[PDB]
Design an enzyme around this catalytic site. Structure first.
Site, short mmCIF file in Angstrom:
data_model
loop_
_atom_site.label_atom_id
_atom_site.label_comp_id
_atom_site.label_asym_id
_atom_site.label_seq_id
_atom_site.Cartn_x
_atom_site.Cartn_y
_atom_site.Cartn_z
N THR A 16 76.06 15.27 115.30
CA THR A 16 76.28 15.43 113.87
C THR A 16 77.28 14.42 113.32
OG1 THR A 16 77.77 17.23 114.53
CG2 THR A 16 75.62 17.84 113.62
N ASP A 39 51.48 -2.53 121.17
CA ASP A 39 52.43 -3.63 121.12
C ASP A 39 52.01 -4.78 122.03
OD1 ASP A 39 55.38 -4.89 121.43
OD2 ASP A 39 55.41 -3.47 119.76
N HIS A 69 58.63 -7.37 124.21
CA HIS A 69 58.84 -6.50 123.06
C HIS A 69 58.35 -5.09 123.34
CE1 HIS A 69 57.96 -5.00 118.89
NE2 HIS A 69 59.12 -5.58 118.65
N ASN A 161 61.60 -5.78 108.63
CA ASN A 161 62.93 -6.38 108.69
C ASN A 161 63.14 -7.46 107.63
OD1 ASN A 161 63.19 -4.85 111.10
ND2 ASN A 161 62.42 -6.57 112.32
N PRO A 175 51.30 6.42 103.16
CA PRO A 175 52.12 7.62 102.95
C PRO A 175 51.98 8.67 104.04
CG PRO A 175 50.89 7.04 100.96
CD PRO A 175 50.32 6.23 102.08
N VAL A 177 51.75 8.44 107.36
CA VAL A 177 52.42 8.22 108.63
C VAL A 177 53.92 8.29 108.42
CG1 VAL A 177 50.51 6.81 109.48
CG2 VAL A 177 52.49 5.70 108.45
N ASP A 200 60.49 7.45 105.40
CA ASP A 200 60.64 8.86 105.76
C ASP A 200 61.99 9.17 106.39
OD1 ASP A 200 57.80 10.02 105.29
OD2 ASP A 200 57.42 8.24 106.51
N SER A 224 61.78 -2.21 114.81
CA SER A 224 61.02 -1.96 116.03
C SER A 224 61.79 -1.08 117.01
CB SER A 224 60.67 -3.29 116.70
OG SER A 224 59.80 -4.04 115.89
N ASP A 260 74.83 10.96 105.61
CA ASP A 260 75.80 10.27 106.45
C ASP A 260 75.72 8.75 106.36
OD1 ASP A 260 76.60 12.75 107.28
OD2 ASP A 260 75.76 12.60 109.31
CA LIG Z 1 54.97 11.16 105.76
#
Ligand SMILES: [Ca+2]
Lengths: 279, 6
Positions: A16, A39, A69, A161, A175, A177, A200, A224, A260
């Site tokens: 937390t 990937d 990667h 990025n 939207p 995923v 998200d 990534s 936070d």
């Molecule tokens: Ca979603």
């Protein structure tokens, strides 16, 4: 359970508050769940995978990870030392060549592949896919990820990025995923992380230590890196029975640490993924 | 026509 002296990102998704170094997690550790890493491949022989990894599909002359990667991303999901879900089964799907690049048609073929292949695997607790890749907006790419999600596979995708709004990138902008941004060790949105209303959740993304090719390790940074933190968390939370592949992204976002983060522009969620473990 | 690692 408790892993002392763990990578900072594992400690953070079980905290937390920042500035801790132990990883607290339930011992089930994602057993019975399967995570597809889509990937550059996975160096399955790496000691850190303990035989739980294997390559199931390539679209190139070789199925080996020549870039590194994908091996790092898979390590963050499920490597014995550096991974969130230390008992998950990982399946590699090489859709990018060893330069890190690929064609959108091959990216789409790999997503539709997983939607079919999961029915030939023992994943009684659920199936996740991690997509630490992206490019410019394309409806077809988005459609492929949405199809994969609807089939019953939690899809987590890196936001990008370019320190811009992720609505102009694919598959990040889809939207349906789970779209994952990056934070650093002082609870700031990483300088490079994309943002926007389509995001998200945030996960650790800066200076992330994990597996590499040649049986080694290294630290690197990007969205990534945050995506497999979220991918592994979903596998962990499904094994515990806390959620389903369909409703997992929403469940992580609702249970997240909220309020936070700094460097979060107005219109972006201030949610950092949290595993809610109480020993 | 190309996507990349991030
Ligand atoms: Ca979603």
């Amino acid at each position: 359970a408790a892993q002392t002296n763990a990578p900072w990102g594992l400690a953070r998704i079980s905290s937390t508050s920042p500035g801790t170094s132990t990883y607290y997690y339930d011992e089930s550790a994602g057993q019975g769940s399967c995570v597809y890493v889509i990937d550059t491949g996975i160096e399955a022989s790496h000691p850190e995978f303990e035989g739980r990894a294997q390559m199931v599909k390539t679209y190139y002359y070789s199925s080996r990870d020549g870039n590194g990667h994908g091996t790092h991303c898979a390590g963050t999901v499920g490597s014995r030392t550096y991974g969130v879900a230390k008992k998950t089964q990982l399946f590699g799907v090489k859709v990018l060549d060893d330069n890190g690049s690929g064609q959108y048609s091959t990216i789409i073929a790999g997503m539709d592949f997983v939607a079919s292949d999961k029915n030939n695997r023992n994943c009684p607790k659920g199936v996740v896919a991690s997509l630490s890749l992206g490019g410019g907006y394309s409806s077809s790419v988005n459609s492929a990820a949405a199809r994969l999600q609807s089939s019953g596979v939690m899809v987590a995708v890196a936001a990008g990025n370019n320190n811009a709004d992720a609505r102009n990138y694919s598959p990040a902008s889809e939207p349906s995923v789970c779209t994952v941004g990056a934070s650093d060790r002082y609870d700031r949105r990483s300088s490079f992380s994309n943002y926007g209303s389509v995001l998200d959740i945030f996960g650790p993304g800066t200076d992330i230590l994990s597996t590499w090719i040649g049986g080694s390790t290294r630290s690197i940074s990007g969205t990534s890196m945050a995506t497999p933190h979220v991918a592994g968390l979903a596998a962990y939370l499904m094994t515990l029975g806390k959620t389903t592949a369909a409703s997992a992204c929403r469940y992580i976002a609702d249970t997240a640490n909220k309020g936070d983060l700094s460097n979060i522009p107005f219109g972006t969620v201030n949610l950092l993924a949290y595993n809610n473990y109480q020993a | 026509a190309a996507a990349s690692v991030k």
